[model samples]
Target chain A: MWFGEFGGQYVPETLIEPLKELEKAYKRFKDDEEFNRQLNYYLKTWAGRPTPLYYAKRLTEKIGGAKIYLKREDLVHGGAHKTNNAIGQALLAKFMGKTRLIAETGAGQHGVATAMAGALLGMKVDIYMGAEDVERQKMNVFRMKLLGANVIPVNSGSRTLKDAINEALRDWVATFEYTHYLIGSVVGPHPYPTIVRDFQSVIGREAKAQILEAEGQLPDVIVACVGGGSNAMGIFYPFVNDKKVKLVGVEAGGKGLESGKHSASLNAGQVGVFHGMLSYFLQDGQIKPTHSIAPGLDYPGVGPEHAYLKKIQRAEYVTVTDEEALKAFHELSRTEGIIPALESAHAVAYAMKLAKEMSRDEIIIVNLSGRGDKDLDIVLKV
Target chain B: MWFGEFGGQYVPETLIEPLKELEKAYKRFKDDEEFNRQLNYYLKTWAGRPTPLYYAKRLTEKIGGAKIYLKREDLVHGGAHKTNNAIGQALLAKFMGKTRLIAETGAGQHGVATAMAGALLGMKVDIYMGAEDVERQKMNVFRMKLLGANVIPVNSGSRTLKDAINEALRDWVATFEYTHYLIGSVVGPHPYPTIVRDFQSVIGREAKAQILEAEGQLPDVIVACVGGGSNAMGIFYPFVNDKKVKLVGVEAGGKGLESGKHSASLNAGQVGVFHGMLSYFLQDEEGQIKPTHSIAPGLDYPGVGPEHAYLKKIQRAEYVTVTDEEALKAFHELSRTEGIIPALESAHAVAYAMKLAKEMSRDEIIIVNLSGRGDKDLDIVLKV
Candidate 1:
């Protein structure tokens, strides 16, 4: 599992066997007919996929630039793109004969998705979350409990998401024989990035075909916000071969990139080992804490695949400030009657700027990674 | 305008001409190609129609009796079946060249739906609500304001939904030329009961096809909770001719029917004229509306739609009640079991189904109408 000089399994000897076991199971199921049939059923009747690639006519006309299309992953079950990968991995766990699912969550989007997958697939689920996050994200915590998942609060190491991931890893080391640790994003080591990207590529696959049918060609520009970059990699992977199409990943530039508080790892980081992958991390020497107004974007490092893409100059990484993201949030809500997550609004903010500089005949597809209903309390305060 | 001597224009003399005008426009658009096209466009993209009919595998197995399927209107945009009618009527207002849409709301579901439809279609919206209701429904009030609708609170009379409707009717009389009264349910006078049902029938139309595709037969029983009864009528209207399929309407039993505090009008109240319809009403011999208690703010109304009254008269529909306590209990059970938090109003129907399932055969199919999400009622439920 390598992406150029990035994306290697830099794990201990104990994890090596588990990773290999996972890799074999995932590969075997890639062609398994019944595995695919069940996965497809859950994707359609359960998660509500093939989410409409809606044309944002009012916003496009208001911007007076490129035709803007939204790949509405917000319409997916559990209100985001997180469920796409969660459902895939949960099914993989079932195929691998696991009876329980374990996961770590930051803002709890992934936690909620995992809980939903477990509830649907009839597996018991345990979610490890930071104590600080458990308090800050009470709604999601309650939602997970409602979905019949046990939420374990981690108090170690600053008592936040980083600690939560550590606790989850510890749990998996002991329970890997009966439980599958459903990693949330594309940042995890080895088969995780590959498995998540492969599952989530449905977004790009659908968007590619839909845009082609709607406009008879690929979009001139594709945009998605990058946190751990599962959503960005998901949409960008399919279009990577098309050189004419520009791939843009917007990061949460908290105040400004120069302020040294933002989570724009690709734009402002150096190569480092993080979460068991060589990737661009926001730290002076070792991995350190980061900040973004969007809780989901407050990550210290990006996916390893994104680091290679940046290294090769195949895709462009950009930044959007909290002020810009909030502006886009309100603008989209009032203009198109669609409320976008603050994380998704970052991509929308950049798309607006990109559209202003392009011709009217051009098209830009934005991966609206999630809905904003979860962020209502945050916005209502603002 | 009459549904078997039950529905008719029983409004003020000044409102007759305005109602006629609305009736004419509605009929004209019933066959209009452009109107249908625009309405369908919003239904697909904006409101997210054809909500899935999902099998309740866990719930069904636990019951060990009838198979259960949920018509997931809770997943619809704006999180309720109310928006189905809201969008249709708002579009009809636009097609009739009206610039403003006015509505009265109790629990604020209808108000929020109207606000969304108004914002999307570029119409000025004003929502009349009771002062007491505004305080209880703060989240929905903020949501309506966010969608660029003006929410006006009424303090007169009981300072609740009845007063809210009074104020809205007053506004419509003077502003009828430019403002269309976007009635929330199938409880208003002649044209509204018919219009709202027709718009809402999309629920039944879609559920019918979806369940048939999944199960290869009609469900043995269709269950829905009744407040103003729009959601019930929406699902029931399409299956009126299916003699084998039993239709059930669950009403709010606040304490118990004998407590005289419940809103089970069709079950306990006498025939009377209320809300501009000659239907079952929770009123005295002098026709004075009495008090009713329902934890669900959408209920506590004095009247139900005339169509429900007619269906009950013909013995085509059966009415049942579950206590507020039972409904609250179910609100949590479904949430923990299926990850679907249903509105308290809908919990009543599901509670009935759970009890009835013990007596039914394993092959029997039950269509559970999950009318809305319970996110709005979380604070109240927690308070209890």
Candidate 2:
């Protein structure tokens, strides 16, 4: 349960046995044929998998360098790649005889996805959201309730994402026998990052097959934005052994890195223990406040695997300012007619720069992690 | 040029030559290999084609009668099947050497779809929307602008959908040499209905193949909502000759058929000439007031293709009241179902299917075309 001393189950003693049980169940079902068949059916029929790998012809022409391709995870149901893990984890919970599912959400993207999964699979779902987030993201809260999920607001501590996570963990500690804590990203303890990355790796697997079928060769570079880094790790995992293909993860550079408001943990921060894993976190003495125009990327800590990749020098980490991300967001909308999520715009922002540096024959694939519909209000304000 | 005397070019003298030219161009490009290849490319890569024909197991079980299958057009790009025809027409316009695309929209679904096509294919787009709608559907207006479209508000006459259509036609009459009027549905004159239906028939073609692969037979019943009836016509066209397959088109009942405030042109309207074609319309001396809880289906009439279908008894036209539509909308959201568009005309279709399913046996298959997503605010007003 370690990624070069980066990942470990650093939870309380009570969680150890439950983690072991989860790890055992996951290992058994991961190889079971019937389990896979059921998972694949739901993924295709319900969540809309195998999203297109679109050639960004206009965008490539505008860039005037490397040809740009987009792995369109934005087209997935519920409007993000987050659905892949949500459905996978939820189905796993059902197979494990768990009748209830619990999760924590920040901006409620994951909560909505979880709620959707529960509704489809006939499971009782409870989403723990911070009271502040519950108030701020009312539309998503409404969406969750519409899908029949119970939203429990946590008022403790900072009353934000981390606090909600703490409450979810407490609930899991007590209810692990009948409830599966569906972690939203490739964070948390040992088995969780593994489980989520495995689920999300479908993005990379499909992208690889699609690119090969389209271009007959591996891309020159693959770019994805890293918050908890699930999307990054998902698309990167399938190509990790391909020594020729370059992997780059972009982090949110809010107001520029010098302003000390960015969420570029992998690009700028030191290693720390948080969220039950040893990962690079934005910390002074303790976890520091992080900011990004993209709420999904506004996290102080990144996934443990991202830290390992950076340490091993297999993947490069970079940052893009909010201004740059917003520019790319609008550019894609106007030029390609694709309104990409602000989180994905960070990756697009970096890819635009990298594409200009490479030759025209070279190909770069950007994992368009989500749709921008959710950010319309945020963008309208800007 | 006629669907059982239901369709004809009943237009002004100035429009005849342009209509003839459009008809000729459509005829040539419709079967050309390269033209089709390019169109198919955009459909697959841009608009996302071959959407799943999902079996609604939970919905089927809940109904406890016929098996429910959904033609998932709701998952299409732009959140509706509107994108299919938009891209097809926009591509045809490009092939015809047209420099600009013009369209009229009411609730702005078609306007947004047209804007996306123009932005994708590098054509100039101008969407003529009603002035009142421009104010009411601000979000869709913003979306169109974000896609780089010019939204012109029509402020003449009633300053509503029909007036916006008048403005678009007027613009098209003058700009026909270099512009294509991208009609939103299977309405209007001869070639527009044929062109839009051919483009949209991809829905039916895919559904037929999918249903066969899944069940090894044609569905017992195919249900779709009808506004301008593009989606319904699209899905029903390929199955028209399959005698065993029953085709049903659900119209917005508004309050009820007896209230004289519905959009059931076939069920409640009489033959009339409007929008450059002879078709059934809600007319009392002239075009009468049409009301529907579903805004997209609020048009006083439907497509000429639908009139042909009903005249020949190839399809059945039914109506679902707004009360039943809203109830089905909530049911789908709460049950093992999907959240669908209020304007989709889909709520009406699904509600009808629920009743139809109850009377049928388990072996029977019911195909419902889930049209699109609705505005969240409107959907939330109803209790789930």
Candidate 3:
């Protein structure tokens, strides 16, 4: 079951059973026709997946090293890639006799998707977001409330994603009888990593078919940012069997990793358990938090699967500084009219750097995990 | 060309030829197969028109009436019915050898449309806005910039929409050779009123077929909001000949129609020239523009299309107001239940029906125009 030393059950003793329970369910339903049917139905009808594998012609012409292709996860229903996993998990939660959903959102993108799924299914949804995020991303909080979810803002700790996750964990445990905890990304306890990857694998499945049709061959490099690594996993999963497709993981360097304030877990970190998964984390000798500015990619730890991928050297990881990402972002905006989420741009920025080494005919597919429409404030002020 | 005594040219003498030039070209190309084909192409590919005629099942069950149907003009590209007119005008301007387009936007909706059209044609665009609006609507300024348009904040008059329009007019008059003023609403001078409506009429044309298929019959009532009344006209044009279908126009009441600061021009104002054409306008004793406000940036105007006023008075159309709070509430509810974020201007229609839904029969169907998405108002609600 292990991809490498990268993924293992790293958690507090209290969550081991719940993690086991999810693992059991995922194993029981991995290829079950009924489970697959329901999963595909929600994915197609609600998430609007099989999102276009758009050929970044404009970007290719402008960047000029490799034939750059974009796996446009942004074109999905909720304007991001989160829905691919959200709708599947929400439906599965409903199937597990759950009547309510508990979720934590960082920038309100996942909150919006959870709200939509809950509303569509007539289930009660509770979302915990940080107080500061509530203030900054209030529109999503209001939207979640409007979608009939009870929004509870967390004020503990930094009052951002960390506090929201803490509050969501508490809510899930207290209401475990009728609630399912839907983690936003792929960095949760044990079973969540595998289940979410399975749900999000549609991105890879579609990309494989699309690239083959468009280029008549497999890609040379698979580039995507590792934010909890769900989207990057999605992009790399389908091509995993293609031994020639070199997998590249981009981490948020966030003001440069040298300052010891970045989310480059795979690039620089020792093995340990954090956020319920045993993975490489950016930490002190005793394990503490680090600083990073890319809100969507501001994680100090890695997903277990990503850690596994990194240890075996099956995948190579790189860090993208904020300055580098911002430049790639504006280039994307002006050249293709596609504003990339800062998290996704971490991958784009790295891919642009990689492009300088490749030939124009070599096809390079980069996972555009999310759209930048939600985070316009950073650029608009200028 | 007249929609009663309300619509006619009241423009300055110096600008006649330019207006005539647009009119002459518009007439020739009005039926030109090439023009028609290209316009339809942009309508589908660029504007996402042929918008759905949605049946409001929830509103219909709540309100007893003739099965209400809606023409989704708000779903049009550029986020409102404004696109229908702007695309047509921009293309016409393209044909007329005008390389630059300028607009005065009240809520930034029109400016967004102008910017989109200009981008589509690879032409230069400048959107003039009041300084006050520039502050309140910062996101739209960024949107225009993203779409490759230069947005200028005008510090004139009250530093609001009126001042912006005055400045845009001045700019257009001075740059008449290479620039064309793309008026936002249907109330502007003669050719504008006529041209805007002609392009907007496609809403009804599509709605007629969609409603006929959905209900197995034509809707008995159609409703939309009125500022310059472009949306109202787009929904009204096709049903104008259908004597059975009642059309309603919702005006921004601010607090109420009797309130002095309200922008319910058709409900209370006298007929006069304001933004170009002869329209019902709210004015003071000295004929200066009166101050007004609406939750919708687009509907804060003190004047309305003369045709909409005439239609209201002649019993051909119904005019009413739904308060700001009610509209916001509706906007919130629609977002939660349907995941459809509606523009404040369009939410007025939904708010009205929700209030009256109780008297409505369960079998009745009501279709409310879920016009534009509410992404722009994210900052406003957060601030509120």
TM-score of each candidate?
Answer: 0.96, 0.96, 0.82
Best by lDDT: 1
Q: Interface RMSD of the predictions, in order shown?
A: 1.8, 2.5, 4.4
**Can you write out model 3's per-residue Cα lDDT over B1-384, one digit (the tens) per residue?**
467778777767877878787789888988899888878867754454567665544334334554544455544544567778888988888888999999998778788888877766657899999999898888878878876789999987789888998898888878978998998778787788778888888887877777667667766567687887887887788888889877778887776666665678887788777776777888888888888778777788789877787787789988888777777887787666555567788888877766645555655545555556566666665555
Q: How do the residues B1-384 of candidate 2 rate in per-residue lDDT, one tens digit apiece? A: 777667888888999988999999998989999999998888887777878888877777887999988887866766788999999999989998999999998878888899999999888999998898798778788888888899999988877787888888899999999999999888888888888889999999999999999999999998887777788889988988787888777776665677665666766677777788877776665465343344343233433353444534533443333434453563445333542223335666677778789899999999988776543344334432
Candidate 1 C-alpha lDDT tens digits along A143-223: 788778999999888898878888888888888998999998997889998899999999999999989888999999999
- Give lDDT: candidate 1, residue B34: 97
Clashing pairs in 1: none
Candidate 1 segments exceeding 4 Å error: B284-286
The deviation in Å at residue B43 for candidate 2 is 1.4
State the displacement of the C-alpha of residue B3, model 1, in Å, after optimal TM-score superposition: 2.0
> Could you tell me how far off, in angstroms, the CA of residue A233 lies in candidate 3 after the best superposition?
4.1
Q: Compute the TM-score of each model's chain A versus the native chain A and list the values.
A: 0.98, 0.99, 0.93
Alpha carbon lDDT of each predicted model? 0.87, 0.83, 0.76
TM-score of 3: 0.82
Best by DockQ: 2
